[PDB]
């Protein structure tokens, strides 16, 4: 047979990311003395649009502790920040939108975003627009914290893991019908070559497992085992249930 | 009451001197044939003396502490009046409208101002007025 279309994204030739207009990797600040023993203040210089992403970025400019200069970094902008805002970062900072605190330093029921999985990864969870995690509880001994991931999963992380207060800007984005194949063309030119999607039904027995036949139909179950093997996997993969919800 | 007076220190916020400190010597509150606005004659220092330290002896101290003054008519709107003060009675005669108009009289009138300021920087009265504003 042939090598199918999803097996063909691994070698990553024309499928790589379209990286040109991107302002940079949006991260939080390296974890250092000043931030874990106290706070350090920047100001947000301009909040700007990043290509390929859905949410704006902010550029806050800190002062390097050990050398005379400025250093400016790329934060995914929480909703409500504004240029000219002081952004405080560190253990002793205060609870306000945009300030990055450790999670142990905030009461339960606090709404933070761009939170870290492990301390010093410079952010992981809830970076898409409109997302947030809630802090639902603490474990002050063998220090952990109980947070609610934007999907609704409940994860338990370290209490030295930082996160920035508030909701990520760009909420409401998918409320608007996209309305034409052109606007979906301008969406994925800045992301990657995924589009448009030929139904595996509509291709030949070589192109796909769903291909062939004098009618268009799958012919065998569209749910595939998690223990399937490379290229067998197309369709709903290792689903526990299927079909419209009620 | 009127806090713009003969001793009142100010900051120069408009033009070539912006950021430098002065002292309001002869204010005209209202009126003049030219300058149809409230203005104040001032004197200030254009160069600030450099950091002097324990380690500098001999001739460096005299050549670090050199002051360069100026005298200028200025509009109130271009001044920040502040709470500080100077004892100005030294040069009250030497900084005047008559000093302007005959610009020779202006470089004759910096000397009596330049001398009064490098005095005060010895005997550290008015420590602040001699320190560079920074911005």
């Amino acid at each position: 047979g042939r090598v199918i279309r999803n097996q063909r994204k691994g070698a990553g030739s024309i499928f790589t990311s379209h990286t040109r207009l991107r302002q940079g990797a949006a991260k939080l600040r390296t974890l250092d003395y000043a931030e874990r023993h106290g706070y350090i203040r920047g100001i947000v210089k301009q909040i700007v649009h990043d290509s390929g992403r859905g949410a704006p970025l902010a550029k806050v400019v800190f002062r390097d502790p050990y050398k005379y200069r400025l250093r400016e970094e790329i934060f995914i902008a929480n909703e409500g920040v504004h240029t000219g805002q002081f952004i405080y970062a560190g253990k002793k900072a205060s609870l306000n939108v945009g300030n990055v605190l450790p999670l142990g330093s905030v009461p339960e029921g606090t709404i933070v975003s761009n939170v870290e999985e492990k301390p010093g990864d410079r952010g992981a969870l809830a970076r898409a627009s409109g997302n947030y995690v809630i802090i639902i509880g603490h474990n002050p001994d063998e220090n952990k914290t109980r947070v609610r991931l934007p999907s609704g999963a409940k994860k338990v992380i370290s209490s030295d893991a930082r996160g920035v207060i508030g909701v990520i800007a760009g909420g409401g984005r998918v409320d608007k019908p996209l309305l034409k194949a052109g606007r979906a063309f301008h969406k994925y030119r800045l992301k990657r070559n995924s589009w448009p999607k030929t139904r595996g039904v509509a291709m030949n027995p070589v192109d796909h497992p769903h291909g062939g036949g004098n009618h268009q139909h799958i012919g065998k179950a569209s749910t595939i085992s998690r223990g399937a093997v490379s290229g067998q996997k197309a369709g709903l993969i290792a689903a526990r249930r299927t079909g419209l919800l009620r | 009451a009127k806090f713009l007076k003969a001793g009142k220190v100010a900051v120069v916020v408009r033009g070539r001197y912006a950021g430098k400190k002065v002292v309001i010597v002869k204010p005209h509150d209202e009126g003049s044939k030219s300058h149809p606005f409230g203005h104040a004659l001032v004197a200030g220092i254009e160069r600030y003396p450099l950091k002097v330290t324990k380690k500098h002896g001999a001739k460096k101290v005299a050549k670090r502490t050199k002051i360069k003054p100026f005298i200028k008519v200025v509009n109130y709107n271009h001044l920040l009046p502040t709470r500080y003060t100077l004892d100005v009675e030294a040069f009250k005669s030497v900084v005047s409208t008559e000093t302007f108009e005959q610009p020779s009289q202006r470089e004759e009138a910096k000397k009596v101002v330049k001398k009064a300021f490098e005095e005060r920087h010895q005997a550290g009265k008015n420590q602040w007025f001699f320190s560079k504003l920074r911005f």
Binding site: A34, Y39, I40, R41, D64, K67 | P49, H121, Q122, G124
Partner: peptide, 29 residues
């Protein structure tokens, strides 16, 4: 004496770029 002033520099994080210290413990050998 009149002309010389007392600065003192405040290392309290948040201000005053840190002085040069002995990093001999931290260096990458």
């Amino acid at each position: 004496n009149p002309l010389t002033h007392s600065t003192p520099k405040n290392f309290g994080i948040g201000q005053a770029v840190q002085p040069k210290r002995n990093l001999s413990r931290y260096v990458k050998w």
